[PDB]
Amino acid sequence: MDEIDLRILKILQYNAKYSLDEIAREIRIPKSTLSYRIKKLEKDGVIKGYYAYINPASLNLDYIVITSVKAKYGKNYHVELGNKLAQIPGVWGVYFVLGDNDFIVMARYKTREEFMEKFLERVMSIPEVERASTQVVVKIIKESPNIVIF
Amino acid sequence: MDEIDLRILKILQYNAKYSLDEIAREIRIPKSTLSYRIKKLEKDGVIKGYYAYINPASLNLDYIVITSVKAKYGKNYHVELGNKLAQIPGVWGVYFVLGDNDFIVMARYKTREEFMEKFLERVMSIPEVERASTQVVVKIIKESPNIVIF
Amino acid sequence: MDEIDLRILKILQYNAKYSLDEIAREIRIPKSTLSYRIKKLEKDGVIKGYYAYINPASLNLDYIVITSVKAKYGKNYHVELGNKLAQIPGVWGVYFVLGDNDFIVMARYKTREEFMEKFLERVMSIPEVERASTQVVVKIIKESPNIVIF
Amino acid sequence: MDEIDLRILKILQYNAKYSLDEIAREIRIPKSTLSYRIKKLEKDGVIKGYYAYINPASLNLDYIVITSVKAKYGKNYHVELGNKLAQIPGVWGVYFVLGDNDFIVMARYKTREEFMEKFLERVMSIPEVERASTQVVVKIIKESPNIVIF
Amino acid sequence: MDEIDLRILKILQYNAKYSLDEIAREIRIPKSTLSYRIKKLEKDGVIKGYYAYINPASLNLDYIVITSVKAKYGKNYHVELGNKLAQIPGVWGVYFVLGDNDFIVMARYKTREEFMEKFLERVMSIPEVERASTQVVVKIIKESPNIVIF
Amino acid sequence: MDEIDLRILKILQYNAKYSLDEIAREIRIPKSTLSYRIKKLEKDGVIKGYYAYINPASLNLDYIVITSVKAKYGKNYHVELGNKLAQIPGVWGVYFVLGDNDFIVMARYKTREEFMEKFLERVMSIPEVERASTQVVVKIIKESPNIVIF
Amino acid sequence: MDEIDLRILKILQYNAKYSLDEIAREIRIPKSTLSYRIKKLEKDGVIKGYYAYINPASLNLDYIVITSVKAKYGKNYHVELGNKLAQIPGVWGVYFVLGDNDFIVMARYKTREEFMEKFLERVMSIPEVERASTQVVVKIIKESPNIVIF
Amino acid sequence: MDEIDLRILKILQYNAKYSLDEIAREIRIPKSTLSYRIKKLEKDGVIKGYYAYINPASLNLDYIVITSVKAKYGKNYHVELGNKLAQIPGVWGVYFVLGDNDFIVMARYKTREEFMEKFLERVMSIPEVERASTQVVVKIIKESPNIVIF
Ligand SMILES: NC(=O)CC[C@H](N)C(=O)O
Ligand SMILES: NC(=O)CC[C@H](N)C(=O)O
Ligand SMILES: NC(=O)CC[C@H](N)C(=O)O
Ligand SMILES: NC(=O)CC[C@H](N)C(=O)O
Ligand SMILES: NC(=O)CC[C@H](N)C(=O)O
Ligand SMILES: NC(=O)CC[C@H](N)C(=O)O
Ligand SMILES: NC(=O)CC[C@H](N)C(=O)O
Ligand SMILES: NC(=O)CC[C@H](N)C(=O)O
Ligand SMILES: [Mg+2]
Ligand SMILES: [Mg+2]
Ligand SMILES: [Mg+2]
Ligand SMILES: [Mg+2]
DSSP states (O other): HHHHHHEEEEEEEETSSHHEEEEEEHHHHOHHHHHHHHHHHHHHHHHOOOEEOOOOOTTTTTTTEEEEEEOSSSSSSHHHHHHHTSSTTTTEEEETTTTEEEEEEEEEESSSHHHHIIIIIHHHHHEEEEEEEEEEEEEOOOOEETTTOO | OOOOHHHHOOOOOOTTTSSSHHHHHHHOOOOOHHHHHHHHHHHSSSSEEEEEEEEGGTTTTOOOEEEEEEEETTHHHHHHEEEEEHHHEEEEEEEEETTTTTEEEEEEESSHHHIIIIIIIIHHOOTTTEEEEEEEEEEEEETTTTTTOO | OOHHHHHHEEEEEEESSSOOOHHHHTOOHHHHHHHHHHHHHHHHTTTEEEEEOOSSSGGGGOOOEEEEEEOSSSSTHHHHHHHHHTTSSSSSEEEETTTTTTEEEEEEEEHHHHHHIIHHHHHHTTEEEEEEEEEEEEEEEEEEOOOOOO | OOOOEEEHHHHHHOOOOHHHHHHHHHTOOOOOOHHHHHHHHHHOOOOOOOEEEEEGGGGGGEEEEEEEEEEEETTTTTHHHHHHHHSSTTEEEEEEETTTTEEEEEESSSSSHHIIIEEEEEEEHEEEEEEEEEEEEEEEEEOTTOOOOO | OOOHHHHHHHEEEOTSSOOOHHHHHHHHHOHHHHHHHHHHHTTTTTTEEEEEEEOGHHHHHHOOEEEEEEOOOTTHHHHHHHHHHHHHHEEEEEETTTTTTEEEEEEEEESHIIIIIIIIIIHHOOOOEEEEEEEEEEEEEOTTTTTOOO | OOHHHHHHHHHTOOOOSSSSHHHHHHHOOOHHHHHHHHHHHHTTEEEEEEEEOOGGGGGGGOOEEEEEEEOOSSSSSHHHHHHHHTSSEEEEEEEEETTTTEEEEEEEESSHHHHIIIIIHHHHHHHEEEEEEEEEEEEEEEEEETOOOO | OOHHHHHHHHHHTTTTOOOEEEEEHHHHHHHHHHHHHHHHHHHSSSEEEEEEOOOOOGTTTTTEEEEEEEEEOOHHHHHHHHHHTTTTTTEEEEEEEEEEEEEEEEEEESSSIIIIIIIIIHHHHHHTTTEEEEEEEEEEEEEEOOOOOO | OOOOOOHHHHHHHOOOTSHHHHHHHTOOHHHHHHHHHHHHHTTTSEEEEEEEEEESGTTOOOOEEEEEEEOOOOHHHHHHHHHHHTTSEEEEEEEEETTEEEEEEEEEEHHHHHIIIIHHHHHOOTTTEEEEEEEEEEEEOOOOOOOOOO
């Protein structure tokens, strides 16, 4: 990757429906070169794909939660817990972090009941779980994971 | 929105570069109808946009952090702190949550130094900040915010 | 339910011994209509019943406690713990909450000894209990659960 | 108060619409005596009143919260904070407790937004508040404050 | 007990070697009456005994500790843990408290090593112990348990 | 101090009303020598005094508390807070400890109200107090501060 | 050891490559005496050895961590855990401390991955480990363990 | 640096008094080459110096402490606090860490009093200090900071 690729990415991260002609004009380079570079980037796996950004509200995803999960130590309990957490419907993010040396789980649901039946009940039944603490998100000030280049 | 729109969205959330002809075939509907519905969805704001999914590693974003920030109570300190946190370069997520009744901030950087100079030093200088606790992410088990329909 | 029912409820929540004639006069409607609506409300279960508000002091309920209980994860331990907690004499409130993802138990007793023998000893013997933390209430600034309409 | 008064209270705490004739029959005493005793109890303030028990769901009170509030020490900050908390619409319970030596606040709202605008924003603006931690109630296993005699 | 007994106790709590003649003079009562009352108090168990107040430093008791111990719930673990803690040489105080709903243990030793071998190693070997947290006392601002009447 | 003095102290710590003749017989030494040594010990300050051990219950000291107090840092706030805490009526013990690097305060009162008016209200008014956490003692398994030699 | 030995040590702790002639001149004593004393010190074990102070950065030791480890109580679990922690490659410091009554482990690694594979995975597999909390060091303000005499 | 330099360092980190002839023999290289490389390493700053390893006990450094210090946010308070902490006599280590986002301070003293007068009193007087928590080290299982190559 070079300076050029960055500018391309800085644009595609925001809007992938920006016609080549428009991008070519902005960064001032041959449309055929651009097309080539974009292919290169995908080939190499820099650009892993293109997604539609859907508004969660539009799907009535009102119950937003961030849960910290502490795992029981020993055997392979840790790694196993992470994967079990990542497959729960509604969970889009699972991170293993230092500090509380545990998992941080991001999930979304339409209501409390859905949350309870799909997430909580499942979680409370997992043996490797020592403890879980759920923080209800009451306001999303910002959520732009797509923005990787500032 | 109806059952049909969902199926369309369930596909566009994963891959927006799926030609209409291919989608039309999968959900079995006229390509012109599909195109219409997709336009409708954008018009109404269900689909807010299309992004390129860029691999963070490809940009050497190695220092991943999740920080909890407690704000000083009173005046308008809270709301103000959230916005100041959302404009720090590298920060893609800011949530106000219950429980610790504070902010959860998601950010990414290439290194510790970058993290320190761009995020920490800035944060430690904000007056409204009572306390901040940063959790270093050592492993991303899953990060698919794009998946809103399971 | 309509605007009218609300006004009726806003009155019955405070004082259920308010003669129909008096209520009819306040909200200005036929006493027979009122009587009908009140019946409707009970029928439908909006009004689940009428109680006598007894002063706890009058019964020497001096030892007031609020206990947080953490449950051991797995099996059905959680749901089971809640019900065991709800049947302890003296306990009038059991809530399963997020954050500490545990139970909050409200209870009243005449003395420390009663508290110990009826609540604590029972609680400490429950297997599913991981930990319990009791907060002694030294002052009730307000306790009006009956007020549902402000 | 004597053994008799207790039996009367043990009944009125559950259902105050139980005709004198029915109560008189249960406890086996003259209806005129009963009526006298009940008056005595009210006179003396044992029975402070009769309320209608309204189902919160019936009023769409879905967002149930239990908040711990720590106050800034000094002056009269403490006592003042308690009263300010007790007058927030939606708050039915305020207790000053030992342990975390702070306040426990019980409140109910129809939604998150209502909760935010009526409770949180108000609370975050109170100067005497050092910190507040809100626990969202996801399940009410039991709530019978009316039951004072077991 | 009456007003007189109090004055007697308020003196004996400070200095038990105060001749009857001196006390009799201070509270102005017959020495024979005093002697009688003091006997009464012992008889009834108000005065459980007379001790020599020994300076801990004089015995090189330099390592002063206050330890909080959390017990594993269930069976009779709790009560059993308390008694095991009360028999450890060096431990003069064991309290079961609310809040952290655990034990607070007061002990004294001449050195760190003594502390380790007599207290810690013993404690760490007790099964019923979930966790222990020792707070080293660096300064005794006041220690007058003998003063019960202010 | 020598081996002999210890044996003397090991006895006087338990019961100071043990006639010289009895002690002389137990440790097998001349009564005049004993009397001399005891004087020496007092002279040198090993034995600081003799107290009457009064049963707290006998004085209706039912509300027993152990409070942790965190002080605001800076100036001389710390040392000042300790002394203010040591002069509150009912407080018999004040320790400055490491770990939570704060104060541990032991106090006794007859009731909750007394506790509130004499201890809490006073404490909450002290400026240097950052935070206080009171643990109610529900059971004294052991309290023998007089025993310094095991 | 005497005043002289101290001055010698105060120099050797900083720079052991300081020729005898130079030291002899600084402390003003016969070079043969100095040489003798230094030998004495080693003989007696005051000086346990001489090391080369290597800059960690020079070895790309970028991932610096400080981990608190809580051990499961009972048997000999504690002592055993300490030794297992002290033999993990990268760990240069293991301390058993009071307060959290646990272990504090100091370690260094070149990267996150190394840290994970050599330290974390090993630690998470140890049975006696109740919980571990890793604090990432982002800045070393000072690290001069060699300085024992100020 | 190359493979050779490592072997040299792996030896000098343990014992710097190992004659060149001995090292030359172990790693099998010309003594003149070795001498050259060692000079290179110092020149480049890989080897920053040679120290005498002094046994702390030999200096009666019995009171070993590890203190966590939280700083007040804002201005330049943080950076300033670190430097003030690094200049306190007895302090050999100051680290700024994530998690509790604070300072970890390592210090040694001969006694509690020294600790109090030199470290604590100084620390409690620093304004930028929000809170400090000292953990007394009761056992050093391992302390070999000199070992950088395993
Ligand atoms: N720069 C452009 O947009 C087009 C350049 C050139 N004609 C090409 O398409 O290869
Ligand atoms: N279903 C299709 O793919 C095409 C249908 C129809 N010929 C249209 O394009 O409107
Ligand atoms: N409004 C009243 O109080 C009475 C109205 C009418 N006479 C009725 O009883 O039905
Ligand atoms: N016991 C009753 O119900 C009635 C008793 C008696 N006739 C009265 O009313 O005074
Ligand atoms: N008051 C005294 O000291 C002595 C009173 C009286 N002579 C008695 O001893 O009984
Ligand atoms: N040993 C005793 O009790 C008395 C010894 C000796 N006659 C004395 O009193 O000095
Ligand atoms: N003081 C010195 O440096 C040397 C003293 C004396 N000539 C010796 O070497 O023993
Ligand atoms: N290898 C050695 O120890 C010595 C090698 C060679 N004679 C030199 O000193 O340069
Ligand atoms: Mg995207
Ligand atoms: Mg009611
Ligand atoms: Mg005494
Ligand atoms: Mg060294």
